[model samples]
Target: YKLVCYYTSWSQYREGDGSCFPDALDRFLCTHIIYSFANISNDHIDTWEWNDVTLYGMLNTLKNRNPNLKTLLSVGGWNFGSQRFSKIASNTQSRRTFIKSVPPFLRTHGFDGLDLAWLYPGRRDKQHFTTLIKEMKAEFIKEAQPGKKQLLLSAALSAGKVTIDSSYDIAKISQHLDFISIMTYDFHGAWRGTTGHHSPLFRGQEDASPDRFSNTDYAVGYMLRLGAPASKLVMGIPTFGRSFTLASSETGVGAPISGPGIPGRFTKEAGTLAYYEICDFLRGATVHRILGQQVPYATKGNQWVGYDDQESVKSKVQYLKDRQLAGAMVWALDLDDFQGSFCGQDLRFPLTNAIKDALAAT
Candidate 1:
C-alpha cells in the first residue's frame, strides 16, 4: 500500500507552534508526501511562495532519514483555477513545452515526480486532459536512461459524477498515468448551508439526488466501474473537518444551518477545524457518531463539526484493503498534531497514527 500525504505550504500560518519545514514529518508515516502546490506561470511552473525552492529541498531531505520515501511536487490545486490548465492542455505547442519543462524542474528540485492537481476540466476539455497525461507519460519515457529511476506522473481528480463523466476518458487516462488520486471530500461544506460529512465511508440512509453520488463508496465504485484499475486508484482522507452552524439543537447529518460554523482556536477559520483543534474542542464538546455514516463528529451549541476520528480512520483503512485499492492519503500532514503539543505526548498524531496502525493491521 502507498500511503501518500500532502504537506500544505501555508500551514505555517495556522495558530500555535506550527512546524514550518519538512523536517517535522515522521519519516515512516507515509510512503510519499506531496507538497500541496506550486504556481503555474505563463510558460512554466513556478514557486507559489518566496521560500518554495528551499522548502522543496527541505522536503527532499526526508529521504536521508527514510531512504524508501518518495517526494512529489504537486502543481495546480483548486486555487489555481482552470484557465492556465485549459490553455496549456488545449494547445499542442503549450502541452509540449509544459511536458518538456517537467523533467528538468523535477530533477533540479530533487523530486520523484509531479502531481497535477487541477480543480477540473470543463465539459469540452475531456480530450485535452487525456492528451496532457499521454504527452506527460511520453516525456517520462523519453527521459528514462540506463539506471535512472523514471519520473512518476500522476493526477489529482474530482469524484463528482458530472465532473468524472465530463472531464475524463477514464480508461484512456488511467493507462497513461502511474496512479490517480480522487478528491473525495467536500461532499458537503459551508456552501450547502446544511450539515453533512465531508468524507463519508458510505452514503447516508437518507441520501437523495445530489447527495447519492457524494459518498466515498459510490465515488470509488463509480471510477472502478468506469474501468479505472483498483490498484491504481488511491482514496483521499481529510485530516480536517467540515463545520457548520446549527439551526437548532438537533444537529444530525441533515440538520439545517444558518451558515459556516465557528472557527477553531488554532486554525482560526470558520467552516473548518484541524484534527488537533478538534481534539481540543472535544474537551468541552459532545461527540456524535452519525448513524450509518461510519464517522464521528462533535457538537457544541451552534457549532457542529463532522470529521474523522480514530474509529473512522480504522474503517477507512480497512475499506482500502477490502477494495484492493492502492492506499489512503490525507489532505495534509500539518493539520494533524505534528508537534504533539496540542494532542498531548501520548496522543501525538491521533489521526495519522491511527491510520498507520490500521494499515499495518490490515
Candidate 2:
C-alpha cells in the first residue's frame, strides 16, 4: 500500500499563501512524495528551476522529520512533452547517458527513487522505452553497495486505451519497475468544448461507445487484463477540477460549452480550478452528483465545473481497496486545501485526508 503524492516545484510561486513549499508539507500524510520534474539537459538529468537545488534540499529534509517517508524525483511532465524522451530513448548512447546518471543523482539529492513521466511513447518508441526501464533497473541493482538499498524505479503512465496499448508493454515494464502510476484524471476537460467530469470513477449513463473507455475503472481493469499486477498499479486522483463556460442554458454533462470557465484567483488558469478555489465556488451553486459515474459537478450561471468532493473521493478510495490495487496518487499536494483556509472544514488537505482515512480503515 502506497500513498504517492506529487509535489509540484512551481507551486512555490502560486499567489500569496496559495504557494506550497516543501516546508509546509505534511510529511506523515503520504508514504511517498515525488518532486515534480527535473529536466533533461544534453541527455543528462538536471534541475529545471533556478532554485531546484535549494528546493531539493528542503524536500529531502522531510525524510529526517519522518524517516518512513520516501522521496523521488520525477523526470518529464506534460509540458516536457514526448519528443525529448523519444530522442533520448531512440539512441543507445543517449539512453545509456541518461540511465548512468540516475543512481548518482538520486544518492546526491537524497532521493529514494526515480519516476519516469514520459507523457506517452509512440508505437516506434515503445520498445525503446521498455529498454530504458530495464537498463535503469539493472543499473540501480549494480550500483547498490553492501549496506545500501537499491533505488526504486517507477513510471507515471497515461490512462487512455490507445496510449496504453501503443506506449507500453505493461507486463514487461512491470517486471522492471517497482510500481506504475496511471494518470487516471484529465479524461475530459475544457479542451473538449463540452461539459464533462474530468475524473469519473466509472462510466456515465450517457457515455456511448468511445466515451465508455474513459473512466478510472476501465483504465485500471484494462491494465490488469494486459498483465499489470494489481499490487503494482497506483491510481491517480486530481486535486483540481476542469471547468467550462456554458454556451447555452443547459449545464449537464455533454452540454455545449463556448470556452473554458473563468480563471481561478490563485491557480489563475482558465478551465481549471484548484480544490480551494472550488470550495469558494460551491457557495450558492447548484450541485449534482452523477450516481452512475461516482463523481460530482456544479453549475453557477454560465460557469460549470466538475470536481471530486469528500464523498466522491471516499468512493474512489473504496474502489481502490475493492480492486486490491496498490494505493492512491494525488496529482499535486499544492492544489489541495493545504492551509485549511477554504472548504470551511477546519481541516487541511480534506481530499487527501479522506483518501488516507478510508485506506487506513479496516
Candidate 3:
C-alpha cells in the first residue's frame, strides 16, 4: 500500500506558526512524498519557487533517515491552470521537449518520479494528454540504467464525472501511468451559495441523482467502470475543510448559505480551514456526522464547515481496502497539525497518522 503525501512549496511563507518547512516533515509518515509543484517554462520543467532548488535538497535529505521513502516532483497545480499544459501537450515539439527534460531534472533533484498535475484537460486536449503520458512513459523506460531505478510516472486527476469524461482517456492513460491519484475532494464549497461537505465519502439522504455523483465512492467506482485498473487508483483525502456563512437558521448539509466563513488565523483562506485551524472551530461548536455520508460537519452560530476527522478517515481507509485500491493520498502534509500545537491530542498529523495506522493493519 502507498501513502502518498503532497508537500506544498508555498507553506513556508504562511503566517507565523503556520509556516512549514521541508525539514519539519516526519520522514516515515509517508511512503511517497510529492513536492507540490514545479512549472513549465520555455516548454521545459522548471522550479516555480525561488528557493525550490535549496528546498529540494532539504526534502530529499529525508531519505537518509528513512531509506524507503520515495519523492516525486509534481508539475502544474490548480493555480497553474490548464492553458500552459495545453500549450505543451498540443504541440509535438513542445511535448517532446518537456518529456526529454523530466528524467535529468528528477535525477538532479533526487526525486524518484514525476507527477503530472494538469488541473484538467479540455475535450480537444484529452487525446493530446494521453499522447503526452504515453510518450513520457516510453522516455522514462528508455532512460533506465542497470544500476538506477526507472523513474515512476503518475497523474493527479479530477474526481468529478464531467471532468473525468471530458478530460481523461482513462483506459489508455492507465496503461502508461504508474498510478492515478483521484482528487476526491472539493465536490462542494461556499461558491454554491449553500452548505455541503467538500469531501463526503458517500451520497447523503438529500442528494439528488445529479448530486449522487459528487462523493468519493462514486468517483472511485466510475474510474473502475471506465477501465482504470483498481490497483493503480489512489483515493485522495483532504486535510482542509470548506466552510460557509449560513443564510438561514438551518445548519445541515443542504442548508442555505450567504457566503464563505471567516478565514483561518494561519491558513488565511476564507471558506477553507486547515485541520489544525479546525481544532479551534470545534471548540463549543455543534458537530454532526451526516447519516449516509460517513463524514462530519460543524455549526457554530451561523458558521458551517465540513471536513474529515479521525473516525471518517479510518472509514475511508477501510473503504479503499475493501475495494483493493492502491492507497490514500493527502493533498498536503503542511495543513495537518505538523507541530501538534492544536487539536488537544498531542498528535502531529492526526488524520494522516490515522490513515497510515489503519492501512498498516491486516
Candidate 4:
C-alpha cells in the first residue's frame, strides 16, 4: 500500500515552527508527499512562497533520504478557488498555454509531478476537465526521455455524489491520470450545523436525508461503481477532528450543535482541533464511540470532538486493504504529533504510522 501525505507549504509559518519541515519528516512513513498549494496565475502556475529559497529544493531533499519518496506540486485548493482553473481548462489556447508552462517549471524545480486540486469542477467544466487531463497526459508523454521517470499526473476530486455526477466524466478522466485522491473527509463539519462524523468508516444509524453519502464506504463505493479503478483510488484520512459546541447538555452523534466548538490552543481555528490538541483536550474529557460507525469521539460539557484514534485508524487501514483500494492518504503531516513529545512516545504518527503498519501486515 502506498502511504501518501500532504505537506502544506504554509505549515513552516505556524507557531513553534510546526514539525513537518522536510528535514523533520519521517521519510519511511510516507511514500509520496504532495506540497499543498501554489497559485494559478493568468495562465501559468506561481508560488506564494520564496520558491528558490526553500519551497522546492528543500522539500525535494526528502527524496535523498528515501530514494523511493516522490514529491508533487499541488496547484489550487479550497482557498485557491476554481475560477482560474475553470478558465484554463475551457479553451484549447488557454489549456495549451497552461500545459506549456507546467513541464518546464517542474523540470527546473525538483518535482516529480503535478496534482490538480481545483476545489471542484462544475457541470459546465465537465468536458474541460477531461480535456485538461488529456492534454496533461500528452504533454507528459512528449516531455519523456530515456533514463528519466515520466512526470506523474493526478487530481484531487470531489466526494459529493451531486458534484461528482455533475462535474466529472470519471471513466474518461481516470484513464489518463495516475491516481485520484478523494477528499473523503469533511462529509460533516461546522458547515453542516449539526454534530456528525467528519470521516466515518461507515454510515451512522441515523444517516439519512442530507447525509446518506457522508461515510468513507459510500464515497469510495460511489467512485468505483461509477467505473473508477480501485487500484488508482486513494482514500484520504484526517489528522484533525471536527469539533462543535453542544446545543444542550445531552450529546451524541445526532445531537443538535449550536455552532463550531472552541478553537484549539495551537491551531486556533474554530470548529477544528489538530491531533496534538485533541490529545491534550482528551485529558479530562469523557470519550465515547459511535456504536455502529466504529469510530471514537470525546465530549466535555459543551465541547465535543469527533476524531480518529489508533484503533479507528487501524479499522480504516483494513478497510482499504479489504476493498483493494490503492492506498491511504493524510491531509497534512504537521497536524500529527510527529516528535513523540506531547501525545506520548507511542502516539507519534499515531494515525499515519498505524495506517502504514496495518497495510504492511494484512
Task: Report how far off residue 196 is in candidate 2 (Å).
Answer: 0.6
Tell me the spans in candidate 4 whose CA falls farther than 4 Å from its real position: 17-19, 51-53, 145-147, 207-210
Report the poorest 10 consecutive residues by lDDT, candidate 4: 14-23
- lDDT winner: 3
Every model: Cα RMSD to truth: 1.5, 1.2, 1.1, 1.7
Which lDDT tens digits does candidate 3 get at residues 1-362? 99999999999999888999999999999999999899899999999899999999899999998999999999999999899899999999999999999999999989999999998899889999999999999999999956569999999999999999999999999999999999999999777778899898988675432387999999999999999999999999999999999988998777889899999999898998999999899999999988888999999998999999999999999999999999999987998888888897688989899999999998
- Worst lDDT run of 10 residues, candidate 2, spans 204-213
Can you write out model 2's per-residue Cα lDDT over 175-205, one digit (the tens) per residue? 9999999999989866777888989999968
Clashes of each: 0, 0, 0, 0
Tell me the tens digit of each residue's lDDT in model 1 across 51-103.
Answer: 88888888899899799999898989988889888999898888888888888
| lDDT pick, better of 1 and 3 | 3
Ranking by TM-score: 3, 2, 1, 4
The residue pairs that clash in candidate 1, if any, are none
Residue 192 local lDDT, model 3: 78
Ranking by lDDT: 3, 2, 1, 4
Candidate 1: stretches off by over 4 Å: 207-210
With candidate 2 superimposed using the best TM-score fit, by how many Å does residue 341's alpha carbon deviate from the native? Answer: 0.3
